[PDB]
Design a protein around this nucleic acid. Structure first.
Lengths: 105, 79, 92, 307, 97, 95, 109, 80, 97
DNA sequence: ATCGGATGTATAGATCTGACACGTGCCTGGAGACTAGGGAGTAATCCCCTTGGCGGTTAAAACGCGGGGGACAGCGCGTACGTGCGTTTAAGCGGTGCTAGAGCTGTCTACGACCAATTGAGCGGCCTCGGCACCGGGATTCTCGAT
DNA sequence: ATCGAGAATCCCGGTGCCGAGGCCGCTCAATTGGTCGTAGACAGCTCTAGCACCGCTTAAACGCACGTACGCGCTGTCCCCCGCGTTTTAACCGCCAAGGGGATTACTCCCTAGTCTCCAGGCACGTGTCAGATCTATACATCCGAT
C-alpha cells in the first residue's frame, strides 16, 4: 500500500513528494519524479554507508563515527568529486605526507 | 579588548601539523591570525545579517550553516 | 516535531551491513547529506522545468538532473536504479 | 630648360596687372589648382589651355611665355580668362572689407588672392583627389594621374608636361588598379567610378559643361551624385569651374576660421561639430556675411590660413 | 642524554594530528574572539553553543585546507618551510584575495 | 512577428542617456547588459526566496530583498543600493 | 478609471516595476510577493545599471570612443574593486583582459 | 573526425599565454594545455549535450552551452 | 644587422594581446575539435554557430586565467619560465585536481 | 644619460556605410478597480538555555637556551628556448545548393491538482546494557648514538 | 654501515558508563477514491539556418639556423626554528544562580491573489542619420639595442 514499498524502496516517497511541492520548485510535479528521487537518494545513502562500514570494520570498530564517513568519502575519487567543496565536521583529514618531507635513507 | 592573540602559537603549530607541515616560519604565526580574522569576519557578517533579518538576538548554528553554505563552504553536522 | 531521515538511513545501513551500528552524531551528517543532495537535485530540476518553458517536474527532469550532478560511474548506477524503481512502480 | 624673364627676354609678353590685383605666389600653390610649380624662383610653370606656360610678375606687369616666339595676343587672352582679369579684385576687397572688419585686417597683408576660371573635368577629378588629404600629397597624385593617362605635351629639363586626362581615358579598363599603384588610395575607384557614371549614365561631357548655365542650387545638386563628390567637393567645383561665385567650401580650414575669427557656432543645426547640416549652415553664414562673391572672399582667408 | 634529531619529532605529531579528530584550538579564546568580531556588527549579541562550535569547525577546516595548499607551494618552491609568501600565493591563486 | 520577447534594452538605454546624454551603446553591450541584469535579478530573487523559506515565511516583502542585497552586494555598494531602494519604496508608498 | 500612470514612474524609477513583479510571480520564488518588493528590486537593479554605465562611460571617454563596446564594460568591471568582487566568477563575452605585467618580468636598467 | 586537438597549434598557445601575462614558455606546456583544454571542453560539452538531449533536440544551441557554463562556474555573459 | 634581445618581443605582443580583443584561436580547428569531442556523447550532432563561438570564448577565458595563475606560480619559484609542474600546481590549488 | 633605428599615434580642403537612432503602426501585457480570505503582525506567557560567577586543578602556554640543518646568496655550465627568415598550408571569405529539423500552430487527452474520509508509521518518550574510552602493565618498533 | 639504550607506540586485560537502540503510545500526515481542469503528447506545416562542397587569397603555421639568457647543480655561510627543560597562567571542569528571549497560543486586520474590463508602453518594422574606417604620406612622439 505504501508508495515506498510499492516501488521497492526504503526512503519515504510521500515525504519526498511533499517536500517537492512545498518547496515550490515548479507549478506542478509528476508522479514518477519523487519515486526516482527516492531511489537516487537510497542508492547514494547505500553507497556512503557501505564504504563507511568497510572503513569502520577496517579499524576494528563496529560503530560508524564521522571519521569513518570522512575516510570513506575521501577514499573514493567519485564521491570525493561529488563532495569536493564541503567539510565533514570532526571528520579529520586524510593521512598523507609528501615524499620530500620523509627522512633520507 | 584585543582577543586575536587567543589563537596561540602552539595551536597554530597543531593546525599546520594536521595540514602536513614540517617547519613553520615566525611570520606565519601572525599571517594566519590575520587570515583567520578575515575569514571569521566574512562568515559572521552573514550570520549576524541573517539574525537581523529573522529579528532575533541569538546567533543560531543554523544561521552559521547557512552563512557558510552561502560562501560555498558547506558544513555537515548541524543542519 | 522536527523531521529527519534517521529511520531510513538506519534501514539502509541494516541492508548493507547487518551487524554494524551508527552513532547519532554521524546520523546527523547522514541527514544533512541526504537533505543537501535532495536540495541540489531538485534545484536543477526546477531550472530544467523553467528552461524548457515547462511547469511540471517529471522523471525525465529528475533523471537529467542526476545525469548533470553526479559524475560518470556513480550517475550511471543512479540512473539505472531510478529507472528500475519507476518501472516497478508503474508496473505495479 | 624652363625659361626665365632675364635669360630669354625676346620670348616674354606682358599683361597690365598690378600685384594688388594678383599675387601668383598666393594663388597657384594654395589648393585651387594643383598643376603649377615654381620651377625657378618667382617663376611658375604649368599647363594652360592645352599648352605649357611659365609666369612671373613685376610690380605692375604679369610676364608670360616647341614655342620659338613671344605669346600672341590671342594666346595672352587665354591667360586673362584663366585669371578672370576683368574682375577687379580691388573693388571686391573694398566691399568685403567694409562689411567685415576681420577680413579688412587680413586683407591688408594678403592682397591679390583671386579665383581661377577652370576646366570642369580637371577641376572635378583634382578635387575628387583633394578629399581627406593634404595639398602636398594631392599635388603628387594629380601629377601621376596626368602622366599616366593624359596627353604628352613638351619636356623642359627633366619635367615632361601632360594635359589633363579625358573622360574616356579615366573610364578605361583597370584604371582603378593603376591609380592605386600610383598611391591614390581609395580615391582611385572614385576617379574610375565617376568617369563612367558621367559617360554611361549622365549623358557624357555635355552634362557637366551645361552646369555652368544652371543655377548654383541645381549644379551642386547634380554633382553630389558622382562618387567622391559630396558637399565640400561639389562646392569647390561650383566655385572654381562652374562660375558659381557665391559657392562657399566648408573644410577643416574654414571650420577653424569661423570658430576663432568670428566666434561662430551652429544655431539651426543639432550638432556642435562638423556635420552635413552644420556645414551647410556655415556656408549660408559666410554667404550672408560677404554676399554674391562670398566664395572668392573664402579663397582669400583660406589662402591666408595656409600661411 | 637522549636527544631526537630535529625533524623526526616534527614528522611525529603529523601522524598524531592527522589520525586525531579533536579541535586543536582552545575553546574559550575562540569563543571570545567570535564575540569580539561580532561586536563590530551588533552590540549585545548572543551565541548558541552549537553556533560557536560550527564556526570553530569551519574555521579550522578552512585553515587546514589553506595550510595544505601552502605546503604544496612550499615543496613546489624547492623549500620545506612555510613562509608568508606561501600563504599569499595560495590565497591569491584560490581566488580569495 | 517574432513573439513578445521581453528585453531590458530600452530601460538600459534610458538610464545610459540620463547618465551620459551623448554616448551611444553597441548591440553587443546591450546583450551583455541584458544578461547582467537578468543574472543579478535571478541572484537576488533566488536569495530572497531562500530567506523566505528559511524563516518559514510565505511571502517576499521588501525586507527580504533588502537582506538579499546586503548578502550579495559587497559593502558600500550594498549601502548605496539599500539607501536608494528605500528612497524608491518610500516614494512609491507616498503615491 | 483615471489617467493611466505606470508604477515605474510613480516611484520615480526607470527600470520597470510591472515587468519585475510579473517575473517574480512567474519565477516560482515564493507563493506570494509583496507590493513593495518589485519596486525595491527595480531600484537596486537601476542603481547597479547606473553604476556600471557610469564606469563604462568614463572608460569610453578615456579611450576617445563615443559608443560603448564590451571591452569598455570589462575594463570598467575589472578596474572597480566592488564590481570585480560582485562579478568575479563571470566572463564578459569578447571583453578582453586587464592590462598588467608582473614587475619581475620587466627588464633591468 | 579524429585527431583534432592538434588543430590548436603551438602559436595559438603562445598567444594565449602572452595574453595571460606569461613572458617565456617551456616545451611541455603545449601538450599539458592541450590536455587541460580537452578536459575542460569534455566537461562543458557533456553538460551541453545533456541539456540538448533533455529538450528532445538534435541541435546544440548557444543557450544550452551558456547554461552548462553557468553550472560549471563561469557564467558567460554575451550570448543570450 | 638588426637582432632583438629575447626579452623584448615577449613584452611586445604581451601588451598587444592584452590591448586587443580577438579570439586568438582559429575558428575552424576549434569547431572540428568540438565536433570530435561531441561525437562520443552523441552521434550526428549539429552545432549552432553561436554555440561554437560561446565555447571558444569560454575556453579562451579559462585558458588565460589558468596561464595567469601558472605565471604567478612560476614567479613564486624564482622562475620566469612556466613549466608543466606550474600548471598542475595551479590546478591543484584551484581545486580542479 | 645619449643616440640612431624601429614602431606607434595624430593628421591630412571628405566620403562612404553597416550599424544605430528614431518615427510609426499595432496590439497585448500592464493598470484601475473591486472582492475574499488568510498570512502575518501583535499581546501574553512560560521555560530553558545562554550568560555570568567561583574555586580547584593541571594541561598547556611562555620562556629560555644549544645547535644543526635548512634557507639563501653566489657562481659556473649548458642547453633550450626566443628570434628571424624562407617555405607550405589550410583558415577565411564569397558563392551556390540542399534539406533536417527548429519552431510555430491545432486538437484532444490523460495526468496531475485538489478535497473528503481513513489509518498506519515514524516521532517523542522511556529504559537497559554493551561497545567503547581510559588506565595500567607488558611486548615490541623506530630512532640515535656506539663501535 | 650494523648493534644496544631509550623512548615510544601497539596488544592486551580489566574497569566503568553513558549513548544506541529496542518497545510503546499516538496523532498527524501518507494513502485511496473520485472529480475536474489544462500541459503537453502527438500531428502537421514552414522556412531557415546548418551542412556540404568548391574556388580563390593570403595571413598564418612549420621548419630550420643560430646564440645568449635562464634553469639547475654545487659550495659555503649563517641564522632561526627545532627539541627540550623549566616556570606560570589561564583554560577546563565541576558546580551555583538567573532572567532574556525564543518558541507557542490565540486574536484580528490589512495585503495581495484573482478577475474583469480598458487602454498606451513597448515591440516589430521601415526609413534617416550618421561614428568608424578609410590608402598612404608625413610630422612628430616613444621605445629599444648599442654606447
Amino acid at each position: 500500500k505504501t508508495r515506498s514499498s510499492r516501488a521497492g524502496l526504503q526512503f519515504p516517497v510521500g515525504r519526498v513528494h511533499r517536500l517537492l511541492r512545498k518547496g515550490n520548485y515548479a507549478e506542478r510535479v509528476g508522479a514518477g519524479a519523487p519515486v526516482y528521487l527516492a531511489a537516487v537518494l537510497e542508492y547514494l545513502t547505500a553507497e556512503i554507508l557501505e564504504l563507511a562500514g568497510n572503513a569502520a570494520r577496517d579499524n576494528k570498530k563496529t560503530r560508524i563515527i564521522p571519521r569513518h564517513l570522512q575516510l570513506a568519502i575521501r577514499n573514493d575519487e567519485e564521491l570525493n568529486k561529488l563532495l569536493g567543496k564541503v567539510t565533514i565536521a570532526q571528520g579529520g583529514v586524510l593521512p598523507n605526507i609528501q615524499a620530500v618531507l620523509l627522512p633520507k635513507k | 579588548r584585543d582577543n586575536i592573540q587567543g589563537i596561540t602559537k602552539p595551536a597554530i603549530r597543531r593546525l599546520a601539523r594536521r595540514g602536513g607541515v614540517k617547519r613553520i616560519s615566525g611570520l606565519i604565526y601572525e599571517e594566519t591570525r590575520g587570515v583567520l580574522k578575515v575569514f571569521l569576519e566574512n562568515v559572521i557578517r552573514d550570520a549576524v545579517t541573517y539574525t537581523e533579518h529573522a529579528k532575533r538576538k541569538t546567533v543560531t548554528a543554523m544561521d552559521v550553516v547557512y552563512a557558510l553554505k552561502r560562501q560555498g563552504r558547506t558544513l555537515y553536522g548541524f543542519g | 516535531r522536527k523531521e529527519s531521515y534517521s529511520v531510513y538511513v538506519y534501514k539502509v545501513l541494516k541492508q548493507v551491513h547487518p551487524d554494524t551500528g551508527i552513532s547519532s552524531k554521524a546520523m546527523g551528517i547522514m541527514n544533512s547529506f541526504v537533505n543537501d543532495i535532495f536540495e541540489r537535485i531538485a534545484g536543477e530540476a526546477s531550472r530544467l522545468a523553467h528552461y524548457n518553458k515547462r511547469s511540471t517536474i517529471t522523471s525525465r527532469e529528475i533523471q537529467t538532473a542526476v545525469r548533470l550532478l553526479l559524475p560518470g560511474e556513480l550517475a550511471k548506477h543512479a540512473v539505472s536504479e531510478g529507472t528500475k524503481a519507476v518501472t516497478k512502480y508503474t508496473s505495479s | 630648360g624652363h625659361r626665365t624673364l632675364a635669360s630669354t627676354p625676346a620670348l616674354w609678353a606682358s599683361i597690365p596687372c598690378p600685384r594688388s590685383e594678383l599675387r601668383l605666389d598666393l594663388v597657384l600653390p594654395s589648393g585651387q589648382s594643383f598643376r603649377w610649380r615654381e620651377q625657378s624662383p618667382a617663376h611658375w610653370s604649368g599647363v594652360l589651355a592645352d599648352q605649357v606656360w611659365t609666369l612671373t610678375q613685376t610690380e605692375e606687369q604679369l610676364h608670360c611665355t616647341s614655342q620659338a616666339s613671344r605669346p600672341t595676343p590671342d594666346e595672352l587672352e587665354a591667360v586673362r580668362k584663366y585669371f578672370q582679369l576683368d574682375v577687379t579684385l580691388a573693388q571686391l576687397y573694398h566691399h568685403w572689407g567694409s562689411v567685415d572688419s576681420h577680413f579688412q585686417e587680413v586683407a591688408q597683408k594678403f592682397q591679390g588672392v583671386r579665383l581661377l576660371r577652370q576646366d570642369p573635368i580637371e577641376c572635378l577629378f583634382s578635387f575628387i583627389c583633394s578629399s581627406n588629404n593634404n595639398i602636398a600629397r594631392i599635388t603628387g597624385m594629380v601629377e601621376r594621374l596626368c602622366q599616366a593617362f593624359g596627353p604628352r605635351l613638351i619636356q623642359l629639363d627633366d619635367v615632361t608636361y601632360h594635359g589633363f586626362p579625358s573622360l574616356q581615358a579615366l573610364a578605361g579598363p583597370e584604371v582603378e588598379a593603376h591609380l592605386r599603384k600610383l598611391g591614390l588610395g581609395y580615391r582611385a575607384r572614385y576617379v574610375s567610378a565617376s568617369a563612367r557614371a558621367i559617360l554611361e549614365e549622365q549623358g557624357g561631357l555635355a552634362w557637366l559643361q551645361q552646369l555652368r548655365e544652371s543655377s548654383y542650387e541645381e549644379a551642386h545638386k547634380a554633382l553630389c551624385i558622382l562618387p567622391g563628390v559630396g558637399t565640400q567637393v561639389a562646392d569647390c567645383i561650383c566655385l572654381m569651374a562652374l562660375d558659381k561665385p557665391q559657392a562657399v567650401p566648408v573644410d577643416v580650414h574654414m571650420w577653424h576660421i569661423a570658430q576663432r575669427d568670428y566666434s561662430w557656432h551652429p544655431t539651426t543645426s543639432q550638432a556642435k561639430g562638423p556635420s552635413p547640416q552644420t556645414n551647410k549652415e556655415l556656408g549660408n553664414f559666410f554667404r550672408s556675411l560677404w554676399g554674391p562673391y562670398a566664395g572668392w572672399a573664402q579663397a582669400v582667408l583660406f589662402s591666408a590660413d595656409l600661411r | 642524554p637522549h636527544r631526537y634529531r630535529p625533524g623526526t619529532v616534527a614528522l611525529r605529531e603529523i601522524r598524531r594530528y592527522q589520525k586525531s579528530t579533536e579541535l586543536l584550538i582552545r575553546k574559550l579564546p575562540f569563543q571570545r574572539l567570535v564575540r569580539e568580531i561580532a561586536q563590530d556588527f551588533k552590540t549585545d549579541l548572543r551565541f548558541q553553543s552549537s553556533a560557536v562550535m560550527a564556526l570553530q569547525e569551519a574555521s579550522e577546516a578552512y585553515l587546514v585546507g589553506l595550510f595544505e595548499d601552502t605546503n604544496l607551494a612550499a615543496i613546489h618552491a624547492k623549500r620545506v618551510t612555510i613562509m608568508p609568501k606561501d600563504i599569499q600565493l595560495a590565497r591569491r591563486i584560490r581566488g580569495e584575495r
